Amino acid sequence: MTFSSTSNLKELLRKVVLDVELGREQVQLLYKPIYDSIADSNL
Amino acid sequence: MTFSSTSNLKELLRKVVLDVELGREQVQLLYKPIYDSIADSNL
């Protein structure tokens, strides 16, 4: 009674997730030191 | 509906001036370290 017989039945076996870094890099605002900001809704 | 139709009518739109530095630059008095100042009004 090898383990390979029961390898397919994943519901029986313990599940442990390989924890790892996932996601996407945050986007920073770089332009602001160069630019003078003027804000008016009626432009 | 048709802002591209009213876009040519510039007189309907708001006139907001783009503030930009205009005018000749200020002048400094550079000669002062090189000169001795006597300021008698009755010269």
Q: CA B43 to CA B36: how far, in whole Å?
A: 15
Amino acid B41 reads: S
Which pair of structure tokens corresponds to residue B14?
């708001």
Tell me how close the Cα of A34 comes to any Cα of chain B, in angstroms. 16
Contact A33, A27 (CB under 8 A): no
Q: Which residues of A touch B (CB under 8 A)?
A: 38, 40, 42-43
Instruction: Tell me the CB-side half-sphere exposure of residue A11, using CA atoms within 13 A.
Output: 0
Is the Cβ pair A40, B14 closer than 8 Å?
A: no
Cβ-proximal residues to A7 (8 Å cutoff; 6+ apart), any chain: A13
Q: CA A25 to CA A10: how far, in whole Å?
A: 34
Residue identified by tokens 């503030």 is B19
Q: CA B7 to CA B1: how far, in whole Å?
A: 12
CA distances from B31 to B35, B37, B41 (A): 7, 11, 21
From chain A, the residues in CB contact with B16 under 8 A are: 40, 42-43
From chain A, the residues in CB contact with B15 under 8 A are: none
* DSSP summary character for residue A17: -
Q: CA A30 to CA A27: how far, in whole Å?
A: 9
Contact B16, A43 (CB under 8 A): yes
